[PDB]
Each structure stands twice: as C-alpha cells, then as structure tokens.
Amino acid sequence: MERYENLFAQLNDRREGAFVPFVTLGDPGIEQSLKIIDTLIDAGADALELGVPFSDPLADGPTIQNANLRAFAAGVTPAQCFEMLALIREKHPTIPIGLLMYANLVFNNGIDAFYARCEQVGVDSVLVADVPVEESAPFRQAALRHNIAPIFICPPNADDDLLRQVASYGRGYTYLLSRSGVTGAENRGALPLHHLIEKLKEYHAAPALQGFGISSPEQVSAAVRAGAAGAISGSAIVKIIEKNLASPKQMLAELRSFVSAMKAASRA
Amino acid sequence: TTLLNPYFGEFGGMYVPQILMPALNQLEEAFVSAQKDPEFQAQFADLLKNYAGRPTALTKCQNITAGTRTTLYLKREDLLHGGAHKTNQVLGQALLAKRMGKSEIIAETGAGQHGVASALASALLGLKCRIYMGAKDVERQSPNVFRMRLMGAEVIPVHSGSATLKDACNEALRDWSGSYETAHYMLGTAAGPHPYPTIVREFQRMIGEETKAQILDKEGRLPDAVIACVGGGSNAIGMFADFINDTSVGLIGVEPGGHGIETGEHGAPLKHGRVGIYFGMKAPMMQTADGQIEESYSISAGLDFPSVGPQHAYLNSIGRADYVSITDDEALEAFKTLCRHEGIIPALESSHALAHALKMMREQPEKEQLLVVNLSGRGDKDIFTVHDILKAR
Numbered sequence: 001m002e003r004y005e006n007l008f009a010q011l012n013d014r015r016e017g018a019f020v021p022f023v024t025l026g027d028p029g030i031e032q033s034l035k036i037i038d039t040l041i042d043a044g045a046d047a048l049e050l051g052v053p054f055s056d057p058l059a060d061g062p063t064i065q066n067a068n069l070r071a072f073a074a075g076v077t078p079a080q081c082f083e084m085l086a087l088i089r090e091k092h093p094t095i096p097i098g099l100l101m102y103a104n105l106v107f108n109n110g111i112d113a114f115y116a117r118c119e120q121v122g123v124d125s126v127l128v129a130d131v132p133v134e135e136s137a138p139f140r141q142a143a144l145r146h147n148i149a150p151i152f153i154c155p156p157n158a159d160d161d162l163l164r165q166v167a168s169y170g171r172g173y174t175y176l177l178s179r180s181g182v183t184g185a186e187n188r189g190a191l192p193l194h195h196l197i198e199k200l201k202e203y204h205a206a207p208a209l210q211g212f213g214i215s216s217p218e219q220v221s222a223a224v225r226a227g228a229a230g231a232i233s234g235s236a237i238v239k240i241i242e243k244n245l246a247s248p249k250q251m252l253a254e255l256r257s258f259v260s261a262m263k264a265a266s267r268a
Numbered sequence: 269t270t271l272l273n274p275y276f277g278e279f280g281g282m283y284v285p286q287i288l289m290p291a292l293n294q295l296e297e298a299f300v301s302a303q304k305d306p307e308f309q310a311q312f313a314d315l316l317k318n319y320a321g322r323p324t325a326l327t328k329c330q331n332i333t334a335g336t337r338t339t340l341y342l343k344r345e346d347l348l349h350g351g352a353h354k355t356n357q358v359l360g361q362a363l364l365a366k367r368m369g370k371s372e373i374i375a376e377t378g379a380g381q382h383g384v385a386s387a388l389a390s391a392l393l394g395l396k397c398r399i400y401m402g403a404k405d406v407e408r409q410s411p412n413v414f415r416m417r418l419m420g421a422e423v424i425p426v427h428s429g430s431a432t433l434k435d436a437c438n439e440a441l442r443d444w445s446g447s448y449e450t451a452h453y454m455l456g457t458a459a460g461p462h463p464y465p466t467i468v469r470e471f472q473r474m475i476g477e478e479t480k481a482q483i484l485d486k487e488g489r490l491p492d493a494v495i496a497c498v499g500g501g502s503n504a505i506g507m508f509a510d511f512i513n514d515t516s517v518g519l520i521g522v523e524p525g526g527h528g529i530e531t532g533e534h535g536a537p538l539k540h541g542r543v544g545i546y547f548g549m550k551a552p553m554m555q556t557a558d559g560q561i562e563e564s565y566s567i568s569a570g571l572d573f574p575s576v577g578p579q580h581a582y583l584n585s586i587g588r589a590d591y592v593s594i595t596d597d598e599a600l601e602a603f604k605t606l607c608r609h610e611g612i613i614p615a616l617e618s619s620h621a622l623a624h625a626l627k628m629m630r631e632q633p634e635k636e637q638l639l640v641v642n643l644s645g646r647g648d649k650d651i652f653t654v655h656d657i658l659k660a661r
C-alpha cells in the first residue's frame with residue numbers, strides 16, 4: 001500500500017504537518033487501549049506509532065518503561081497485539097500505522113514471518129529501535145518484500161554518510177531524533193538542524209518526522225516550520241494514560257483535548 | 269563500518285540504537301590505537317603487576333586428585349586484588365576511558381563483583397563511577413553495595429522490568445545513550461555489542477598466557493584441557509584465548525545448571541537457549557516462546573544471566589570448545605571439597621568449573637589427564653550462602 005505517501009501528499013496539499021502520537025499496545029488493557037487509539041484518531045492523529053510490549057525496551061525512558069509494564073500486567077502478548085492491529089486497520093482504512101519494535105520480537109521466530117504478519121494485518125511501517133543502519137540489511141529487505149516501510153533514525157549530528165544511508169534505506173518517513181538519550185517528555189530536544197532537514201531532502205529521503213521530547217503544541221509548530229513533515233509525541237500521551245488509570249472516561253477526554261491541541265498546531 | 273570484525277560467525281554484532289553507534293565506533297578506534305601503543309601497554313602492565321598482583325599463582329592440587337590419573341592445577345585469579353579476575357579488564361577499560369578523555373564511568377552489576385571492580389579502578393584512576401544494579405540484587409548484595417559506596421561510587425537501584433541484572437544492563441545503555449560524550453560504559457563481561465566481547469577478551473587474555481607459561485614450566489607440556497565457568501564469558505575467554513590455536517588443548521566452558529536443566533531453573537543459554545538479539549548482540553539466550561527475555565537462575569549470582577558472550581557461541585558452533593553444565597548441588601560439593609582438601613575457599617562461580625573437573629576425574633579415574641581449572645574468584649562472599657544451605661543438611 002502507499003498510506004504514508006498518500007497522507008504526505010494530502011497534508012502537503014493543505015500546507016499541513018503530520019501529528020503522530022505513540023502509545024503502547026494494550027496499555028493499560030486491550031479494550032481500553034483500543035478505545036484510546038480510536039480517541040487519538042478521532043481527535044485528529046494523522047498516523048500512529050504503536051509499541052509492542054517488550055521485556056527490555058532499552059531506547060525508552062521511565063514513562064514508556066511503565067507503559068510496557070502495565071501492558072504486561074494485563075497479560076498483553078505480541079499475538080494479542082497483532083489481533084488489535086487487525087481490528088484497528090479494519091476500522092480505519094487509510095491512517096498510516098507504524099510499529100515500534102525491539103529486534104528480538106522481530107527476529108526470534110523469523111524475520112520474514114514477522115514482516116509477513118505485519119503485511120497481513122495492514123501495518124505500514126516498522127521501526128526496530130535496536131537495529132542501527134549498520135545491522136539493518138535483513139530487516140529492511142524483509143520489510144520491502146512485504147510492502148512494509150522500514151523506518152530509520154537520523155540522530156541530530158548524523159554525518160553525510162549516515163544521512164545518505166538513511167535516505168536510501170528508509171521508506172515511509174525518516175525519523176529525526178530531537179536529541180540523544182531515550183524517550184521522555186521530561187527532556188526537550190532541539191529544533192531540527194536546517195542542514196539535516198535540507199540534506200535529507202537533497203538525498204530524496206522519506207519525509208521527516210521529528211520525535212523525542214515533543215510534548216507541547218509550540219514544538220509541533222516549530223518542527224513543521226523547520227521543514228519537517230510533522231512530529232511524533234509519545235511520553236506526553238502515555239503520561240495522560242498513567243495519570244488517569246482510575247478514571248477511564250477522563251483519560252479519553254484528556255487524550256482528546258491534548259491530541260486536538262497538538263494537531264491544531266500542525267495546521268498552516 | 270568498523271576496524272575489526274564485530275562478529276564471531278553468526279554471533280555478535282552491534283544491535284544498539286543508532287544514537288549509540290558513534291560511541292561504539294569511538295571506543296573501537298581508541299582500543300585499536302591503545303593496542304598498538306607501547307606506553308598504554310606498559311601502563312596497563314604496571315597496574316596489573318604492582319596494583320593487582322599479577323602474575324597469579326598456578327597451584328597444583330594433589331590432595332583432591334589422590335588415587336587417580338588426573339593432575340589438576342588451579343589458576344589463582346582468586347588471589348587477584350578484589351578477589352576475582354574482573355580486576356584485570358576494569359583496569360584496561362579505565363585506561364581506555366582516560367585515553368578517550370572521559371571522566372565518568374557507568375557500570376552494570378548483578379552479583380556486585382563487577383560494581384566493586386569498576387569502583388576500585390575508578391577510585392585509583394580518578395574517574396567518577398556510577399553503577400546500575402537491579403533493586404532485587406541491591407537487596408541481596410549489601411556487602412558489595414557497601415564496598416562500592418566506600419570506594420566513592422554512586423549505586424543506582426534499577427526498579428524497571430525484573431529489577432535484576434538484565435534490567436541494570438538496559439539502564440546502563442539508556443544512560444550511555446545520553447552521556448557517551450563524557451562517560452565511558454565499563455561493561456562487565458565479554459558480551460554486549462562490539463567492541464566489548466573483543467576488548468574484554470584482550471584485557472583478560474593474560475590469564476591464559478600466564479597459565480601456558482606456568483604449565484610449560486611445571487609440566488613441560490600444554491594442558492589436556494582448560495576448564496572455566498561461563499556467566500557472561502570473560503574469565504573463560506580470558507583462559508581460552510591463548511590456547512585457541514593449540515588444537516590439542518581442550519576448552520571446556522561450564523554453564524550454571526541451577527536446580528537442573530530439566531527444571532528450567534538454570535542459566536545455560538549456550539546449550540539450552542535459542543538465538544536471539546538482546547543487549548546489543550546476537551547470541552543464544554533464555555527467552556519465552558514469544559521472544560521475551562527470560563529469568564535465569566543459579567545459586568551463584570555471577571553466573572545468573574540469560575545470555576552469553578558471542579565468541580563462546582561461535583567456539584561451540586565450530587566444535588573448538590565444548591560447553592557443559594553443573595548444578596547448584598554439584599557446585600556446592602566442589603566448594604566444600606576444595607575448602608577441606610586444599611584450604612582454598614573458591615567462589616561459587618568458580619566452583620562450577622571445579623565441579624566439572626572433579627567429574628572428569630571421578631568418571632574416568634584411570635584416564636591420564638592434565639587439567640587446569642580457572643579459579644576465577646575467592647569464596648569468602650559465599651560462606652553464609654553455603655552455611656545457610658548446609659544448615660538444613
């Protein structure tokens with residue numbers, strides 16, 4: 001399919017940036033997670049980044065560590081995640097869906113089989129957090145064989161060789177890291193360096209989404225102004241879940257308010 | 269792109285977030301440079317000799333083997349400053365940190381021995397040391413935690429995931445992914461992403477080099493086999509390295525069998541796990557059917573980790589080294605036997621290696637064999653554990 005390409009073309013036609021929330025699948029349970037995700041979409045999410053709970057999420061800060069723990073407390077498994085993904089796609093045909101994976105969950109039972117299952121349920125992209133471009137060959141090859149975009153990470157101080165590799169190897173969108181470190185709303189990244197954004201465009205990279213530490217509407221606006229196609233926010237979204245565990249109705253209302261505000265910031 | 273091969277056959281690699289690749293490349297370059305630098309080598313050798321007490325003895329153990337055709341020597345890493353082999357490689361890694369201009373050290377620890385080793389090297393060499401330790405391990409290792417604090421290290425409990433060693437490993441990498449510009453990650457074993465399996469081997473290889481010189485001096489020939497316990501793989505690869513090209517010399521690694529392989533309560537991924545990708549490496553690991561990283565178990569905390577260094581997986585795959593397991597009860601018997609017959613209190617980790625050598629002897633007592641066990645550490649730390657278990661019996 002061409003869900004990211006179609007989205008970016010539509011957004012470009014509206015002179016508009018993408019707002020893309022991250023949540024952990026099955027946090028804090030399967031049924032509530034499904035309701036959360038429908039809320040994110042209704043409030044104006046342009047695409048989703050969805051985490052499969054993993055025992056050892058070494059690119060995540062405490063907020064998302066805790067999301068993983070909550071999902072495990074609910075007994076959430078990768079198979080259940082794939083069931084959820086099929087249902088999400090069945091409800092929402094066009095929204096791009098990206099997974100945030102750790103390598104062992106993609107590898108352990110067969111790389112090709114993993115990407116085939118992604119294709120079957122209608123996932124659009126897979127970002128494997130602990131597979132750098134240097135180790136990416138079998139992952140990106142399997143992704144492309146199954147019409148899945150492999151997402152690569154452009155660190156803020158990427159050299160020319162890395163930019164060329166990320167531009168060549170990636171599809172769907174290019175992940176532009178706001179800073180070093182791990183996920184977390186408590187640590188704000190930098191503005192996208194004009195040089196990176198421009199170099200990525202020079203090398204015909206997939207459109208850039210800025211992520212890490214994006215927690216306010218102003219940051220979304222700033223990312224788009226700098227020439228990124230949009231912004232990803234995770235910890236800020238997950239914090240609303242964490243804050244409202246005992247109040248599922250309020251949780252949805254707060255997620256709606258937040259996503260609406262973040263999406264509004266992306267409009268020209 | 270790298271200067272050295274990150275793989276041992278299919279095993280190893282650099283499975284870290286993109287943000288950490290410059291840190292690994294920087295470390296590899298500094299290592300390659302250091303290895304060619306006579307001044308670095310001389311500094312390292314001086315610390316090993318005058319601070320750590322190398323060379324360590326090679327002790328012939330006659331009482332244990334009486335009435336058999338086994339001749340057994342123990343390589344006495346228990347006599348190294350700090351009481352375990354870990355001191356060798358922490359001194360080398362501290363010197364690399366300084367070479368790169370780093371002022372801070374991060375380390376993971378489970379049993380606490382690596383934490384103590386990192387702390388002592390950091391105290392000596394003027395580095396600010398922080399140590400990640402799973403909260404469950406903190407609770408179990410008050411003595412080591414106190415030692416680390418006495419040596420000026422900051423000990424940071426890790427409450428995420430299973431609150432044990434693998435979780436401390438994750439947290440160390442999380443920290444480094446934000447702090448690499450100023451901090452060096454002093455990984456505690458011959459595992460994790462390249463270049464750590466290579467660096468740790470090279471900074472432990474004096475174990476095997478000395479053993480070779482000492483056995484040639486005393487016996488006029490190489491051992492029939494060298495035997496070492498395998499937690500993450502450092503003491504074993506340090507013993508094995510200099511013998512790899514001596515094709516006649518058996519290399520035997522001993523994984524912890526815990527309560528028994530059949531119970532699933534063990535730490536023997538090389539022979540009983542499945543290849544996965546975790547902690548920056550492709551290696552055999554204990555994992556659930558779905559690929560979550562599993563809980564390992566051993567009586568000995570030093571061996572209690574669900575994976576193993578990639579060079580061991582490779583040496584196994586090509587048949588150059590053989591790997592076996594030893595249960596808690598076998599290790600306990602070896603511990604008691606060494607105390608009573610040789611007056612040496614071995615680490616329960618090392619007791620796994622000794623137990624296997626005792627088995628080799630006892631199973632075939634008229635087989636002529638010259639064996640070296642790497643006695644990776646002393647067992648003062650284990651006396652209450654052994655006391656408490658033997659309180660029942």
Ligand SMILES: O=P(O)(O)OCCNS(=O)(=O)c1ccc(OC(F)(F)F)cc1
Pocket residue numbers: 022049050059060064100127128129130153175177182183184185211212213214232233234235236285286287
């Ligand atoms: O808003 P924050 O700071 O919580 O960031 C949320 C990011 N969520 S994500 O799935 O895009 C994401 C993307 C990349 C990650 O690691 C990697 F760069 F190493 F690959 C981890 C998570």
Ligand SMILES: *Cc1c(COP(=O)(O)O)cnc(C)c1O
Pocket residue numbers: 351352353354379381382456457458497498499500501502503504570571615617618644645646
């Ligand atoms: C830590 C430790 C081990 C296990 O670690 P390896 O890296 O496998 O050597 C073995 N023996 C002792 C005494 C230890 O302290």
Ligand SMILES: N[C@@H](Cc1c[nH]c2ccccc12)C(=O)O
Pocket residue numbers: 376377378379380381382383433437455456457459499500569570571572573
């Ligand atoms: N748990 C032991 C040995 C160790 C340190 N880091 C490790 C990583 C993997 C396996 C074992 C280890 C210690 O802390 O002293």
Ligand SMILES: [Cl-]
Pocket residue numbers: none
């Ligand atoms: Cl010498």
Ligand SMILES: [Cl-]
Pocket residue numbers: 527528529595
């Ligand atoms: Cl048994």
Ligand SMILES: [Cs+]
Pocket residue numbers: 221264265266267268
């Ligand atoms: Cs705007």
Ligand SMILES: [Cs+]
Pocket residue numbers: 321322323324325
């Ligand atoms: Cs000595």
Ligand SMILES: [Cs+]
Pocket residue numbers: 333334335336337338339
């Ligand atoms: Cs003998």
Ligand SMILES: [Cs+]
Pocket residue numbers: 498499500523524535536537571572573574575576
């Ligand atoms: Cs192990």
